[PDB]
Coordinates of C-alpha atoms in Angstrom, one line a residue:
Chain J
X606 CA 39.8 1.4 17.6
X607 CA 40.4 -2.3 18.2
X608 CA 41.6 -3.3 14.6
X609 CA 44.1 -1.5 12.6
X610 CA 42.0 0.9 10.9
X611 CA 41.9 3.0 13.4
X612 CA 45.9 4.2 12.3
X613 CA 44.4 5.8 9.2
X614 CA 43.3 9.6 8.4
X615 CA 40.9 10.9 10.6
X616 CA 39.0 11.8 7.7
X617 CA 38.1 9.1 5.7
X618 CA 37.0 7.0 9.6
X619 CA 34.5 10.0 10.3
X620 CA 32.9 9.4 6.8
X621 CA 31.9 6.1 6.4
X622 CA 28.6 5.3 8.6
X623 CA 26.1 2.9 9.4
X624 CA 22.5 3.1 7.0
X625 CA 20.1 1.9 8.4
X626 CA 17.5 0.5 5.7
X627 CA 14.0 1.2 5.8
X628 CA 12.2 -1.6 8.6
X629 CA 11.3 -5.0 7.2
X630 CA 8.2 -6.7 8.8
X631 CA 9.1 -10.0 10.8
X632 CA 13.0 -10.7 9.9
X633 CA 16.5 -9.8 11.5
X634 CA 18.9 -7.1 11.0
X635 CA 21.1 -9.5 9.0
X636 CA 18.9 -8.6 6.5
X637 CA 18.8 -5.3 6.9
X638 CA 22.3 -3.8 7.9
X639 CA 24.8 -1.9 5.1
X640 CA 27.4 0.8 5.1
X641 CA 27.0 3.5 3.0
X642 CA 30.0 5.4 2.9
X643 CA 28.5 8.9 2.2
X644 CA 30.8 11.6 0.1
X645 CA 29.7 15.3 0.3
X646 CA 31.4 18.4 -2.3
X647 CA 34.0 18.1 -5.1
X648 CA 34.8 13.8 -4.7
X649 CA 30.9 13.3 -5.3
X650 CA 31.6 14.6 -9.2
X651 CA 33.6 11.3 -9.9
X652 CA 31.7 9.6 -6.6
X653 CA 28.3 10.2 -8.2
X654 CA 24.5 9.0 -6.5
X655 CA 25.2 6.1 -9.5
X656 CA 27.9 5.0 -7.9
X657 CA 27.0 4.2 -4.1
X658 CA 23.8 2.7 -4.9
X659 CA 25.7 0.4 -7.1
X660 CA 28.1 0.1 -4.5
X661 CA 25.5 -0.9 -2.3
X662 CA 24.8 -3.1 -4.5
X663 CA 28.2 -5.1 -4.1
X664 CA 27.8 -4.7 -0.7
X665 CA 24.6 -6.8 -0.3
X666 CA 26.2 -9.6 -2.4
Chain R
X11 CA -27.9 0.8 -19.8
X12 CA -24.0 2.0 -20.9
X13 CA -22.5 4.0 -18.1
X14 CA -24.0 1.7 -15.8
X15 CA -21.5 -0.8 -17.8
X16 CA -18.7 1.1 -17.7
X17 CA -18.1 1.5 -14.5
X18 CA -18.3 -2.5 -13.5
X19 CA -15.6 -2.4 -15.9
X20 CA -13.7 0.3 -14.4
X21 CA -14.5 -1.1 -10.7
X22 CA -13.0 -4.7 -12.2
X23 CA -9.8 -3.0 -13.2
X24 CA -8.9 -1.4 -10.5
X25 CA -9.9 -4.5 -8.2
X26 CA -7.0 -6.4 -10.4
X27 CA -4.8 -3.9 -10.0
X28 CA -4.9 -3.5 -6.0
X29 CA -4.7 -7.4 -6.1
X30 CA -1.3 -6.9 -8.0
X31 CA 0.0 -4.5 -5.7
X32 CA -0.9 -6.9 -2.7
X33 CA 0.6 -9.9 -4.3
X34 CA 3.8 -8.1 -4.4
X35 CA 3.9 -6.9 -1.3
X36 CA 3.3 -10.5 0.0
X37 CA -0.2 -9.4 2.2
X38 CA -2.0 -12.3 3.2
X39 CA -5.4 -10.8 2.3
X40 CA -6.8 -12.6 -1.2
X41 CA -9.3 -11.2 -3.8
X42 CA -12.8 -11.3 -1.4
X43 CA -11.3 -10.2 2.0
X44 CA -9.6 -7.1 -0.1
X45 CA -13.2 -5.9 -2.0
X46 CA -14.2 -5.4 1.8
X47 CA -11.0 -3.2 3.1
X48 CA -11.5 -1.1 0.1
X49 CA -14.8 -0.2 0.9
X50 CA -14.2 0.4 4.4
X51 CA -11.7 2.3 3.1
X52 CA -14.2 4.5 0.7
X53 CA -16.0 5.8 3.7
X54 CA -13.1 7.0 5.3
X55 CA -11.2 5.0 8.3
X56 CA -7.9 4.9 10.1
X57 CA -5.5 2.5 8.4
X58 CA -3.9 2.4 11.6
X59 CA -6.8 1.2 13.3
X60 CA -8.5 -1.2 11.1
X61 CA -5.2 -2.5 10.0
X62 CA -4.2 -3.8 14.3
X63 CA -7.8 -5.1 13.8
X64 CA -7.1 -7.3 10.7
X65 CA -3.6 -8.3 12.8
X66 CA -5.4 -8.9 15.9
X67 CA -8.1 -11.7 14.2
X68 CA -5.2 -13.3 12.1
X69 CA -3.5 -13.8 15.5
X70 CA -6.4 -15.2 17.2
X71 CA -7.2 -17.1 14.0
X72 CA -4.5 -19.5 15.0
X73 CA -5.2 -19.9 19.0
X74 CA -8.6 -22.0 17.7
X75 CA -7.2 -23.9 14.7
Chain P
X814 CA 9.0 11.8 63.4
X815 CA 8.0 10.0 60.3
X816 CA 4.2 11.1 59.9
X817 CA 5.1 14.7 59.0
X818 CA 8.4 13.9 57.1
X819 CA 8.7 10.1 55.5
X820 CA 5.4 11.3 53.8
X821 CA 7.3 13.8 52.6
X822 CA 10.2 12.0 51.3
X823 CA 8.1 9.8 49.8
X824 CA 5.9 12.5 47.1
X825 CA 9.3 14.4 46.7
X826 CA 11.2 11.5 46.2
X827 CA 8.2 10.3 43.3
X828 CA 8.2 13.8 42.0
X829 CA 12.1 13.8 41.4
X830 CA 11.9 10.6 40.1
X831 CA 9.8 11.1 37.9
X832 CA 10.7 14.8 36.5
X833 CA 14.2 13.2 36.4
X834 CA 12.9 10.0 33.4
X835 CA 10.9 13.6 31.8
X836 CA 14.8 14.8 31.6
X837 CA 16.2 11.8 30.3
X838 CA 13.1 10.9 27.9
X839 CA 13.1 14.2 26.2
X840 CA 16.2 14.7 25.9
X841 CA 16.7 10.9 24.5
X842 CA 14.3 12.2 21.6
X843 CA 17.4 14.6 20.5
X844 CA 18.7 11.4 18.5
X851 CA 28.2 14.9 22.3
X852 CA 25.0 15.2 22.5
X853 CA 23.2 12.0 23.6
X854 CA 25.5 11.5 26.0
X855 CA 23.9 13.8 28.4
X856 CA 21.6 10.8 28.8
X857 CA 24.4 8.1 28.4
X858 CA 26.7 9.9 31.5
X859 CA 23.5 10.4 33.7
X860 CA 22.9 6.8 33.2
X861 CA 25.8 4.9 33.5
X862 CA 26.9 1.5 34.3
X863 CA 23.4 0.2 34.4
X864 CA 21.9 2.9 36.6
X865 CA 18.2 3.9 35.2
X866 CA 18.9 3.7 31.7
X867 CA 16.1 1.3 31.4
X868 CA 12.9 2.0 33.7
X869 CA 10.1 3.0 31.4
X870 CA 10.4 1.7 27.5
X871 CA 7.5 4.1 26.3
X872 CA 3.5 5.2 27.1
X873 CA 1.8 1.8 26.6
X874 CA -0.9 3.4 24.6
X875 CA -2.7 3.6 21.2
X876 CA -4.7 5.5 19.0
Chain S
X7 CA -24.1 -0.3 4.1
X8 CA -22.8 1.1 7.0
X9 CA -19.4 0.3 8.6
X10 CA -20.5 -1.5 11.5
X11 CA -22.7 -4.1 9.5
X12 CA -19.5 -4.1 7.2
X13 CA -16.9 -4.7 10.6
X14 CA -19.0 -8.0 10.4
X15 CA -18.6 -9.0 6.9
X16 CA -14.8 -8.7 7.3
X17 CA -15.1 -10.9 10.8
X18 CA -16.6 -13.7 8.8
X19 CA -13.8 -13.0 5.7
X20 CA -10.8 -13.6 7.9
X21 CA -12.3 -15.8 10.6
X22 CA -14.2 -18.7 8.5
X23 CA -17.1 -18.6 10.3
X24 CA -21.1 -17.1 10.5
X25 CA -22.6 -14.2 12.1
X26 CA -24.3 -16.3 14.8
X27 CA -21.4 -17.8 15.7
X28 CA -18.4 -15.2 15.9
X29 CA -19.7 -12.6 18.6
X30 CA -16.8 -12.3 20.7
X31 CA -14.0 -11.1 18.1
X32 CA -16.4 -9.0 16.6
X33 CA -17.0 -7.3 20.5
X34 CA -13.2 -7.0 20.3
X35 CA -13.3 -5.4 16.6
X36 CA -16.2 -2.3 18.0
X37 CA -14.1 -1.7 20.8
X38 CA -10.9 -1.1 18.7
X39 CA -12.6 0.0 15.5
X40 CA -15.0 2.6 17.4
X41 CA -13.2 5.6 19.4
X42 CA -10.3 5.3 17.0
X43 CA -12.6 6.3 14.1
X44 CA -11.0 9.5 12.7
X45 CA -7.8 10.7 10.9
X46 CA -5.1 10.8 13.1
X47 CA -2.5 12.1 11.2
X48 CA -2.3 14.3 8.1
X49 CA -3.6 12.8 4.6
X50 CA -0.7 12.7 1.7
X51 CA -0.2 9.8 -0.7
X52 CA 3.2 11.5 -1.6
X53 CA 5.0 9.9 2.0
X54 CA 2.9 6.6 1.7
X55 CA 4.1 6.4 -2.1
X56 CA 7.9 7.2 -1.2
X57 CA 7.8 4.8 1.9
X58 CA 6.2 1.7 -0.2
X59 CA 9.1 2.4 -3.1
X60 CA 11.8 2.3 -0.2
X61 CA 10.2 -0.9 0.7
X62 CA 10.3 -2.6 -2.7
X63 CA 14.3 -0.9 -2.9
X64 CA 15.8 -2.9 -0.6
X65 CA 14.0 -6.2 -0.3
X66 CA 16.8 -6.3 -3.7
X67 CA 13.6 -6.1 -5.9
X68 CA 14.1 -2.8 -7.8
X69 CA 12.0 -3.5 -10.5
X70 CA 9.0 -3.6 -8.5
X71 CA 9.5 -0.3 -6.7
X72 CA 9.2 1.3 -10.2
X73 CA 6.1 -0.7 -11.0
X74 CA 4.3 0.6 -8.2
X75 CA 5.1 3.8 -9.7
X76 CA 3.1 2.6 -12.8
X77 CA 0.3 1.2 -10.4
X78 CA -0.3 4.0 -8.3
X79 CA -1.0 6.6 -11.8
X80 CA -3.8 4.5 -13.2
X81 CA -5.5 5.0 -9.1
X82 CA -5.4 8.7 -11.0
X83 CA -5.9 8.1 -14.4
X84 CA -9.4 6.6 -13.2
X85 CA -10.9 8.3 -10.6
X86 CA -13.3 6.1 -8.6
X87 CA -11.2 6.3 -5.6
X88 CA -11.6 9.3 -3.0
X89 CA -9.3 8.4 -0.3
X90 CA -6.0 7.3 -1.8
X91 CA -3.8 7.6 0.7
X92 CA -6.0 5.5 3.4
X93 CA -5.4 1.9 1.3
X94 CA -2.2 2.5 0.3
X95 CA -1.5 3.0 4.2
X96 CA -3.2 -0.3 4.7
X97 CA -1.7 -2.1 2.4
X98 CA 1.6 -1.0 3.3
X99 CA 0.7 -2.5 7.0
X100 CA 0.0 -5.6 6.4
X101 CA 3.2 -6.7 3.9
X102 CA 5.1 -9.3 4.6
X103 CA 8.7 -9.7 3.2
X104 CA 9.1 -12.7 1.5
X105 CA 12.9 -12.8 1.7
X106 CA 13.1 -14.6 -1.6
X107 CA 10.8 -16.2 -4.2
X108 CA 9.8 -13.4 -6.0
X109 CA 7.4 -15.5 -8.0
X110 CA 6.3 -13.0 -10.6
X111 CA 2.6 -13.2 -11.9
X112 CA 1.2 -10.6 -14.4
X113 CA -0.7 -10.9 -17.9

């Protein structure tokens, strides 16, 4: 709400979410902390499971 | 005789193998403190138990050094 | 005056106490809906009194 | 042996010391060891195995998450062990991330 994405679609701000990883012994959430944005019926055909964990991928770089 | 041969090899293997898997996962424990968590394993113990035990006298390990 | 009722205040006022972190603590296990918790304890207000049973085993 | 002689062995592993002279941990280790001796929770490699492959997924070392796959068949393929799931719960406690330096050995 306190950038601009908030003026967007209702849907696409509802769909995107925090992961959480799986817990590291002794480090920081810096680490550990990624967005996943999950994709659920017809989109998930061109938006495959190939496709976020690749994405995920970018986002750890 | 044989069979009492085979299975020094087969205990040898699997002792390498472990040691692999705890290299990788970056455990502190080496090749002679891991042939004694293994057996105490054998008999049937609580992972959860012994394993606060081995992170209690690694943490008390460093108070007298 | 106080014999008969203070020591009364005092085990009801343990008993709600308590019965009222059993609300909040099992319903803070539930993860609109956390916010049961969240609008019980507001601004600061016993949102943090007991972490968890300090136990083992 | 039994497991409290074998407590003591693993005193005198971790702590450099003899039997004669480390008493006091080893009170500490019958006192945690004992009471706390039985299962807990229900037995299943199958969790421990898909926990332990999440945990070599996103330290960014994907290739060893399916090596542990490899790893954790031969345990099978031999047969000398009768509780699986007890040292791979273990072993899964006492990891450490490196961050980084992913030094591989093998060979």
């Amino acid at each position: 709400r306190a950038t601009n994405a908030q003026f967007d679609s209702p849907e696409i701000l509802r769909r995107l979410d925090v992961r959480l990883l799986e817990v590291s012994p002794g480090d920081t959430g810096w680490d550990v902390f990624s967005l996943d944005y999950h994709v659920d019926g017809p989109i998930a055909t061109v938006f495959t499971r190939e496709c976020m964990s690749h994405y995920l991928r970018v986002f750890n770089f | 005789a044989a069979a009492a041969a085979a299975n020094l090899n087969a205990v040898r293997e699997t002792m390498d193998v472990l040691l692999e898997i705890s290299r990788i996962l970056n455990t502190g424990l080496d090749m002679e403190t891991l042939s004694i968590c293994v057996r105490l394993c054998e008999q049937g113990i609580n992972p959860e138990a012994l394993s606060s035990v081995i992170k209690e006298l690694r943490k008390a390990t460093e108070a007298l050094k | 005056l106080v014999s008969g009722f203070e020591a009364t205040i005092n085990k009801f006022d343990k008993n709600f106490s308590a019965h009222l972190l059993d609300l909040l603590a099992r319903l803070s296990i539930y993860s609109g809906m956390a916010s049961v918790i969240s609008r019980l304890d507001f601004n600061g207000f016993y949102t943090e009194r007991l972490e968890r049973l300090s136990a083992e085993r | 042996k039994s497991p409290n002689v074998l407590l003591q062995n693993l005193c005198c592993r971790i702590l450099g010391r003899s039997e004669a002279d480390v008493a006091q941990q080893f009170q500490y280790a019958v006192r945690v060891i004992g009471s706390n001796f039985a299962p807990t929770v229900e037995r299943d490699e199958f969790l421990v195995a898909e926990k332990i492959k999440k945990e070599l997924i996103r330290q960014r070392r994907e290739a060893d998450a399916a090596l542990f796959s490899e790893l954790h068949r031969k345990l099978h393929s031999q047969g000398v062990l009768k509780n699986k799931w007890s040292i791979l719960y273990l072993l899964l406690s006492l990891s450490e991330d490196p961050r980084r330096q992913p030094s591989k050995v093998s060979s």
